[PDB]
Nucleic acid binder design. Structure first.
Lengths: 322, 322, 322, 322
DNA sequence: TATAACTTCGTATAGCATACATTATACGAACTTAT
DNA sequence: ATAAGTTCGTATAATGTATGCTATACGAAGTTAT
DNA sequence: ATAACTTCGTATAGCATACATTATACGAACTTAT
DNA sequence: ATAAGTTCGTATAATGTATGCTATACGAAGTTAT
């Protein structure tokens, strides 16, 4: 019992070893799990298998997604494992009910959604519409969309880019150094190249904003209503704002969102990553190069990205209509 | 011993954690194992390494395929792991006997078999031989063969297709929404578009069957001896019947099978999937796109289907022939 | 003591789990180790770390290669580990001296040797020298050399080819099914494709030898002095004779070997393997394709194979001179 | 307790099991670790998880690179494992700080440096300034740079070349046999060929310095203030002097260093390796052949050198530019 | 004076890499139910 | 009598799932320099 | 006899995976024959 | 007095290594249908 309190202490002490998001979801799950326990006269820690099973079935009855429920169990599992205690998933009660929840839901029709693709055709169209704008916000959003499509970097990674991370090739193309991704933490890091055209877009943003006045300034910053950019070495442009750019750009071309309330009705943070991967698959780009561009080590993720390739223009329809 | 019983009751309580096909096979392997144990005066549960190795040598001598033998061991492993007992596979004896069996059967010449290919030329041939038939049966069978080849859906997936799952694209093609995906993250996508030709085959079947009288009706249904269709919203046409279609079509063209007992002498449920993969390969469709079309994540299942094609011969052939 | 005998008896009971060559070397090393123990008054089993150290230094003093010394230790390690005993390498005395011997020898000049390359130029020269021969032995040899270069198969793998393992692509090119290699054992196997040219060479051998009179016959067999082939479904052509073919072909072009006693003064069983890998590397074939050609799953052996690329016509000299 | 003392004496007896560079670093880390322990009132051996953690945080606060911190950790791991004691790394506390330290340092902008490239353009320039310099110092220095660039041998390897390692090729080029290879399986080969141009440079040095008066003499040696070389078969030019040649050459063209304390402000011992890799990449030489040229088996080292070249920009730039 | 263009936040959900186990078809035979 | 299925048990081919994270998705409420 | 092997025993290379050393950088303090 | 080294300690970049097999290398000695 002293081991448990000490094991948890060490995790909290070195809390920076984990992602801020991992912590944020840990607490979120704990609130949900603790509130349910209080209301059902159960002990929230350490978690008893039978209780966790009743709780996961409650989550299913609430109509939550399979990947949502897995997250709640996962966080429960981490809290226990890193305490030095057995996990709920170490028992049949919990591991079987999770298999059961996943099976029942998939059979009921559940499938994991995917972001609406932001592909080359969308990029060229947005560019032709926005490229002649002298508006500071338009010069920024166009430079952002360029980088997102060119590099397949997560919006959180783009937000972290600082001026000092930018270098050039012998041919004058921009190179962006990334030291940290979701799956890689290195001092060697990775280099993302930008095409001549995308480079030009970023160059225009740099001169109009004044970001290069301090090498520590983040490349992307907020632009206030009077069209003046406010560069900062301490404050990143939020992922929410970056998601907003994707959405505003979708609104610019296609109008308001459908009323369904579903996710992925407009472009979002993940859109350019999937769009670029699809364009690569379609152009016949070899797998090694696809993964080099996406920064992926395993080939299974390519199938994740291209799963929703348009079947009406798919290989089978085209072959049969011979 | 109370623990083992507790574990089995948990396994019973959450039956739905595993597919019914999994349960049917567990039972089957248990019957074979317990009958062999009974005969040879061995305890069947918990299973002992020495007895499992003698059983596996029996499976070999009997002439079962390596994959069949792995399946019996795998079913025994699961039962023991879920019971809380040591897995047969984790002992030295069983581990050594599997390596021996694998190596012996391979050197004896045992070959992994696969569905006889149902390709474009077969599909063309069948359409050409059967298009003049106005029989309900023949119209249905043609629509089934058309769907199977066009979509690469497996027989169970085709059997689950309901009328409400069907819509129309701006091009006038039929689109089949997948109501129950294979997995949570559906590598095959959420939709399957039909060609204009295959649309016409399904349309014809829809009008002669009357399945569109209720959108909850399954697309395919049984047709009795008087050419009268019996549409249903509750009862699917068995996957056995769908294999029957494939087999009966092969019988029409090539005649009756050998009384040998070999597998894959006529077409079967996976024939159109094998066939379509080969045709895309001939058409120069890239591996990732072929894989998305069938919903494959494992490239080696695909490679097995296309490995005897001239375009797959490798770099040494190209170097030598230039 | 009883545990150890049981563990050893079980390994021997399932001999077939290991290669014949693993057993041959286990027995070779044991004789050597046990003879040295007898003359030096040491107990041979279980081996004491100090005694094993002395033996390794003894092998060093004899001037044996590092990989020879490693094989001796390796077999000693296997015998102990599979007995359920700690390995000699589990102690500092043995593992440190092995590192030391390796390091001392490499500092003294030692490097692992590689087979002399049998490249495309070499193959074409032999082909245009021996094409015309109607001698049954020469037809066989040329077919062998073609397969060896085209497939990059080990000689033992080629010796194992049975007539039934041969099939055709629609274009008429030969396919060889191989179910077992040094790193792969599977009923699915792999298919090695031959060029139209190499296919013609094999066809000629099949026509001349009469091997196709029984599908179970090995493709390659001995040819006696009257130029008549002796097909067999039970007796292989020895890997020794296969090496002889490489040795005789080399002698035909460069005359009798030097009497220095050094290895790889002429072509041998591994030569077409390294030569083909170098031709692919020089022809700018992609890593994945090189690996597919040689049936390798990890990228590091590519570097092993091409380590001895001719420096004089290598990239740097060509870069500096033009 | 005495088992640990026996293990350490095994370590001393077979000290040649590790490089003397490994030894020098181990002592260095031990001194740092023991000095910190003595200052902070902690027992230095065995090392406790909590104490190791605090020491790592100290190294971080000191401003040491992540690799430097790993190096220190690795040494402590080695010392303990060989002692038969549990490793610091295998603890919760140490695993957690390493993740934390790596993430913090990367985010704080820490970058792994690499040698400033010495490329063909630099080599031609130096050659056009020192070609006719008749001074003995310059003839040697230019011969060294030539070999360094042509062979991609490391400084230590270049210092070990002796006269008897040199021979003539059929085409009039100097062929340098590698007397002592990097590893048992030498990825770089056993032979380095010099171009006709670099051959002239090396010949000039041989004739003007008198090293070929004894075949056992090292190729390179001291050249004192009076322009007289002092050939030696027992002592080599220090790798330190060879770095000085690179540094002095850089000062020749660009003057005194930026003096910002930073590394790689002038050329160093790895500069010609980096530079040759980049030049091969420009010329379109295959990755595998670039890797063979410098003995590389880890592609990621090569990539770090060439990833900021236009030819290595990736598929997305390629797709976006046409 | 409100207001663009954010930022912060909560719950809900997807993407990664690695390790390794179910899950679906195949098919002859035995039933079954409307002709 | 029988067409055309369904149900079933076992043989074997075909992919499947968990883990331990780390990330985006988006409506809602709050903030600051205009 | 003899071609053309086979058999055999010892010596040594190739493979896939999982993890640990081994080299260079460089300012400073010496050393040595001009 | 000094050019041009060498030695040294520590920072950091660069690859390196063991493991548990499975394979070939090749001289020699023995074999069998001509």
């Amino acid at each position: 019992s002293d081991e448990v309190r000490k094991n948890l202490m060490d995790m909290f002490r070195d809390r920076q070893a984990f992602s801020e998001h991992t912590w944020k979801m840990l607490l979120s799950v704990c609130r949900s799990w603790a509130a349910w326990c209080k209301l059902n006269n159960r002990k929230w820690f350490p978690a008893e298998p039978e209780d966790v099973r009743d709780y996961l079935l409650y989550l299913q009855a609430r109509g939550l997604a399979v990947k949502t429920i897995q997250q709640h169990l996962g966080q429960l599992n981490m809290l226990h494992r890193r305490s030095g205690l057995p996990r709920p998933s170490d028992s049949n009660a919990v591991s079987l009910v999770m298999r059961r929840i996943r099976k029942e839901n998939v059979d009921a029709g559940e499938r994991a959604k995917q972001a609406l693709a932001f592909e080359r055709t969308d990029f060229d169209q947005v560019r032709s519409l926005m490229e002649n704008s002298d508006r500071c916000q338009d010069i920024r959003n166009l430079a952002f969309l360029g980088i997102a499509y060119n590099t397949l970097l997560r919006i959180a990674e783009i937000a972290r880019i600082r001026v000092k991370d930018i270098s050039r090739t012998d041919g004058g193309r921009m190179l962006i150094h990334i030291g940290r991704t979701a799956t890689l933490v290195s001092t060697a890091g990775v280099e993302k190249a930008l095409s001549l055209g995308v480079t030009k877009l970023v160059e225009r943003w740099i001169s109009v904003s004044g970001v290069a006045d301090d090498p520590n300034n983040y490349l992307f910053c907020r632009v206030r209503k009077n069209g003046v950019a406010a560069p900062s070495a301490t404050s990143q442009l939020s992922t929410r704002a970056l998601e907003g750019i994707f959405e505003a750009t979708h609104r610019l071309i296609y109008g308001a969102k459908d009323d369904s309330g579903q996710r992925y009705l407009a472009w979002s943070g993940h859109s350019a990553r999937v769009g670029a991967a699809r364009d690569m698959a379609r152009a016949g780009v070899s797998i090694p190069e696809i993964m080099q561009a996406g920064g992926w080590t395993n080939v299974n993720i390519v199938m994740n990205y291209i799963r929703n390739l348009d079947s009406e223009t798919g290989a089978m329809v085209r072959l049969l209509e011979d």
